[PDB]
């Protein structure tokens, strides 16, 4: 009695419809929440880069090694942009893709619920109408029989006659449900199949939107991520210790020009 | 009058030494703060993956596509791990590296300042000791001679003959000094020079190490240094491509639909 074929259990296939709308909601939020995280990290990176671009500037570090060190806040900036770029590609391109599909696939009934849920609910019920009727007409003819049976095994004449009458009807109803049973299955099959087709439209779209997000989350397989570190490494391997020393000698040490003592008239 | 060669301008070179100690601190705090940032991203992703792994589990989403959607929460988890390691490396490998270098390079004295700073300042003083003396004598001489000159310009008759005799007697002393200064400059230079070169060698060991530590930091920050970062979006994609719409449908048919078994009506006694 959890079988789709039992009266009323097509309802799970019906809830499934509603579910789809909710899951669209769910995906939208999921994506949204990931965006706010990618933003927080990019913001914190720029802040840090601001901090230190300034502290490295105002401090005693000089020459090329001051620049190499400063090339790090440059990656923090470039990397932050990339995350801030991921946040937009999630909100302008992915969350919107789902918003519009959701918008167009489900039409709320101005009065309530979805037009898509109603139609399936309505079609199952019509498909099941006769079967449900017979199925109650079989409830009685069994009760009235099981009652005349347990009553004829009590008076142990007219009781045995009433059991031949109830048994006869009962078996006739079995005959019907049998004859009606195939069209019922055809009918329900038909509505169910219309439900799959709609759910397939959704899953297929889901799979597509999922690949979209994987693409907007992947900083690798992007030349821009890998490039910032080729660049950083180049910037640092650039720095020359000697060169820095030579620059200090020349501007703060024995390299400085000097006006030595000379005769002064007057 | 800001040239290194002017008296006591070796000062900046001495400062450079103390400066290197503080720059070690500065690099440490820098790396430490960045590590805190990496850690934060790490946690927020971890939290996100957990909340959503749960929401998706308990949701109405079933089959392949649930696993696929769920496969994102996994890349969040893996990407968290990678940043948590950036943080670890920044703290445990890099920050620690400069700390131990800083500890071996600078030696505070019980009685004030760093050993290696005093050594440098003693070096420069000793080296500049004579030169500054001659250099003060040259200031005396120079004024004397100039006073005599002024005194004489004012006078121009027996006052003139006494005033000429001074200009002469004094111009002699001023002159006799310039000559000493001149002749002792090369030694002054040599000595200042030797001391500065010791300072260069020390700062070179610092800069050199600094460059090496900046590489270390670059490799740690770079998630693209490891194939682990590629293989997380390689794995992610192949999980989603694993998705099968029609198979999920077929699964639901037999699990919730017309494929579900059924005990059709029968005679019961
Ligand atoms: Ca600076
Ligand atoms: Ca689920």
């Amino acid at each position: 009695t959890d079988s789709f074929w039992e009266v009323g259990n097509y309802k799970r296939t019906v809830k499934r419809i509603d579910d789809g709308h909710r899951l669209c909601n769910d995906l939208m939020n999921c994506v949204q929440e990931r965006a706010k995280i990618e933003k927080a990290y990019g913001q914190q990176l720029t802040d840090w880069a601001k901090r230190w671009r300034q502290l490295i500037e105002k401090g005693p570090q000089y020459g090329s090694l001051e620049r190499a060190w400063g090339a790090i806040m440059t990656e923090a900036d470039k990397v932050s942009e990339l995350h801030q770029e991921v946040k937009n590609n999630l909100l302008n391109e992915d969350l919107e893709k789902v918003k519009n599909w959701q918008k167009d696939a489900y039409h709320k009934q101005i009065m309530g619920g979805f037009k898509e849920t109603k139609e399936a609910e309505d079609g199952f019920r019509k498909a099941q109408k006769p079967w449900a009727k017979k199925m109650k007409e079989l409830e009685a003819a069994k009760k009235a029989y099981h009652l005349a049976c347990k009553e004829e095994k009590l008076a142990m004449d007219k009781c045995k006659q009433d059991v031949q009458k109830t048994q006869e009807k009962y078996e006739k109803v079995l005959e019907d449900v049998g004859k009606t049973t195939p069209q019922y299955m055809e009918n329900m099959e038909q509505v169910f199949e219309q439900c799959q087709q709609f759910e397939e439209k959704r899953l297929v779209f889901l799979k597509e939107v999922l690949l979209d997000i994987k693409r907007h989350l992947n900083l690798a397989e992007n030349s821009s991520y890998i490039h910032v570190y080729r660049e950083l490494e180049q910037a640092i391997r650039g720095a020359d210790a000697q060169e820095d020393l030579r620059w200090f000698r020349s501007t703060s040490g024995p390299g400085m020009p000097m006006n030595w003592p000379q005769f002064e008239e007057w």
Side-chain angles (χ1 to χ4, degrees), chain A residues 3-59:
Chain A
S3 185
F4 167 89
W5 294 110
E6 304 279 336
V7 168
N9 294 2
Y10 58 85
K11 102 246 275 206
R12 284 180 262 102
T13 300
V14 168
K15 280 50 207 314
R16 206 247 224 108
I17 308 290
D18 297 313
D19 288 343
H21 175 84
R22 180 259 261 263
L23 298 183
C24 278
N25 275 13
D26 274 6
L27 218 210
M28 282 189 325
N29 292 338
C30 176
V31 166
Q32 210 183 42
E33 280 164 51
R34 166 62 93 114
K36 137 168 178 140
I37 278 161
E38 297 285 291
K39 194 210 192 195
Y41 174 57
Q43 193 29 218
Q44 269 190 326
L45 285 190
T46 48
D47 286 1
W48 179 78
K50 208 212 221 274
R51 263 270 283 180
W52 288 93
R53 184 159 283 121
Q54 236 140 111
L55 299 169
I56 288 179
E57 156 99 14
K58 295 166 194 292

